[PDB]
């Protein structure tokens, strides 16, 4: 499942858009618009669990990548939106603790909108693209070809093991 949850200025989901056909079958039947990120993560992971797109008994990996462009402020100061973004990431990390608790690895990556745009033209989701980000940070040569064809299990494993083995 590959999904992009648009979050609007009310700290609610504007629209949910799947990038993978299996994720379409996850989104169907779920109200996600007046939910927060943690809510969406929980809805998506739990439906993927039922449907067999993620295993509860088997070891998996979930990547929550959030990309945020703050080009607005409103009120009298941009800290109004920054408090919303604080609550946003507050909510994101709580989902991680909730969904990973079953013995599944869940991780958080942060991206900018410019990174989101790069993943859109390659029609890939931001989670797998965020492992590509870590490849660039650790100076490992992973290509966009690698990222789009590979499994997220392989992607997170190779990057986090790179930072473990010398």
């Amino acid at each position: 499942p590959s999904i992009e949850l648009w979050i609007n200025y009310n700290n609610k989901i504007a629209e949910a858009k799947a990038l993978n056909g299996d994720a379409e079958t996850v989104l169907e039947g779920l109200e996600l618009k007046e939910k927060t990120v943690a809510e969406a993560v929980n809805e998506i992971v739990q439906k993927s669990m039922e449907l067999g797109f993620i295993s509860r008994e088997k070891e998996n990996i979930i990547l929550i990548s959030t990309a945020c462009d703050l080009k607005a402020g409103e009120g009298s100061e941009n800290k109004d939106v920054q408090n919303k973004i604080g609550q946003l990431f507050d909510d994101v990390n709580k989902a991680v603790s909730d969904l990973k608790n079953s013995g599944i690895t869940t991780r958080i990556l942060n991206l900018t909108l410019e990174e989101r745009e790069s993943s859109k033209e390659e029609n890939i989701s931001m989670g797998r693209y965020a492992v590509y980000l870590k490849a660039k940070e650790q100076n490992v040569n992973l290509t966009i070809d690698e990222i789009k064809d590979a499994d997220l299990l392989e992607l997170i494993a190779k990057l986090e093991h790179h930072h473990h083995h010398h």
């Binding site: 648009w6 993927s48 990548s65 703050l70 989701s125 499994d151 299990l153």
Partner: peptide, 10 residues
Amino acid sequence: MYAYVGIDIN
């Protein structure tokens, strides 16, 4: 405009 959350599973 605000945030975009990418959820990748598998």
